[model samples]
Target chain A: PNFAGTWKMRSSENFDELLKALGVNAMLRKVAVAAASKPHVEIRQDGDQFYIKTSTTVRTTEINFKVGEGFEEETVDGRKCRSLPTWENENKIHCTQTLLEGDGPKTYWTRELANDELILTFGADDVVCTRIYVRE
Target chain B: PNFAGTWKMRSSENFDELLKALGVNAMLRKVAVAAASKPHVEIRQDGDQFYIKTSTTVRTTEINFKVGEGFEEETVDGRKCRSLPTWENENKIHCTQTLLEGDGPKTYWTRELANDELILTFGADDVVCTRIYVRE
Candidate 1:
């Protein structure tokens, strides 16, 4: 089983261009460019269920998903994707996000626990952003 | 102080627009929006020494820094920033990235760990993106 502790983000690599690739408008992009997008994060897993929560100074996001169950995911940015999260191994959870609008490639996200650190990698196309977090 | 791990990405909220907001040109944006960006990630941390290695299908990047120390950060997108990563608390680490070109907001990132998951948050201006990763 994975460790159960409150976590927070600490570092992000190559994130400045990520929101732009998502098609955010000028109005929103202006604010996004001037500040680092950081969130307070929490995670819980039991049996076949998992819950993840992210809180920012501006707003909060919560995600509940069952392993291997497909659901319609409304991305925090308001885009819709068909998402299914599954366990690939004891220490890794893999999620596939297929855009419902059929405009772009399907995206894959993987979360892996390594000792006291949690690492997340996300991308589609040419941009990949890797972020690292610590246990709280 | 151990931050070693292999992690994969799951989601990038508001990423596309962030790249555009950072002035990533049209050529790179074309690929960034066309596919998913999942990469292989590895981190090594010993006391205050930290190293990160990121590998994707198209390229690879390595970063070395320390807690409470500031260093020059050159991102994959060809932008530069003055980066300082510090411990917010025993369980969380926070990083600040100030662009060297004198534009955009100072970006921030935080990392926190919980049981089996690693949560990372990155933001600039007013927008933040949260990502969660499980143990590998």
Candidate 2:
């Protein structure tokens, strides 16, 4: 499964619950959920480094990391965290983010291809959100 | 008043009513009103041309034009219009936007300096919104 491509969000479920568990404020959460289009993800790989770019209505952010290497990150909602990503299999990638300096919840993320569509799953405590994306 | 710097939003009044009169949907209006920080404005002048950039939580857009010259534009909320800007005085700039398509309302914009703050005024029909910004 080649993961280097631009993908546009097709659908999402349980995202509000995940954002709530991640300690995002109600006002910001409302704006995120009400956006006309969800964020677009672009993935690129170069040797041991992977670049993932997320473009939302208001901003675009890019993260670069190597598999198994932990990196500090400031989340879109302004939480500081350390993230580590690993390849679970040829077709799957998994990542875990732990809060660095706040009471924000830890999160787990999984990416895979299913039915020719990109599937992203996010977990925060007992909340799980799933999003599907089609190549752009 | 020199308008050649970056400005951060300090306050807003009647913005929701202006958005409503501009034909924005209820969901988007809620999001815009609930935003933690309003859009930032950056203005730059080069000879007779002016560049105005507005940045919100989701995106940043820049428009370039000369005084009294009408230009086509696609607004942040996705309305197509033709805008003509003129200098009302050394301290004031005013612009009128006429819709190019659809039923979106026509709008008027004013930029000025008042009490050491950058003041932006938006007008749509009987609705008028005022926003204040401080130099960043």
Question: What range of 10 consecutive residues in model 1 chain A has the weakest lDDT sum?
Answer: A27-36
**Per-residue alpha-carbon lDDT of candidate 1 for residues A32-51, written as tens digits (9 for 90 to 100):** 43333566779887866877
- In candidate 1 the C-alpha lDDT for residue B74 amounts to 51
- After superposing candidate 2 on the true structure, give the runs of residues whose Cα lies further than 4 Å from its correct spot: B1-136
| Tens digits of lDDT, candidate 2, A23-125 | 5445445566666357889999775577889877755679888877888775434567788888888777788887787655667788887767888888887
lDDT of 1 at A34: 30
Candidate 2 residue B10 C-alpha distance from true site, Å: 13
TM-score of chain A of 2: 0.87
Q: Give a tens-digit lDDT track for model 1, residues B1-136.
A: 3456876765556655555666554434434433324556677878778788767766567888888989887532345788888988766788888877657755777777655456677675576657676545
Off by over 4 Å in 1: A1-3, A25-27, A33-36, B1-136
So what's the TM-score on candidate 1? 0.46
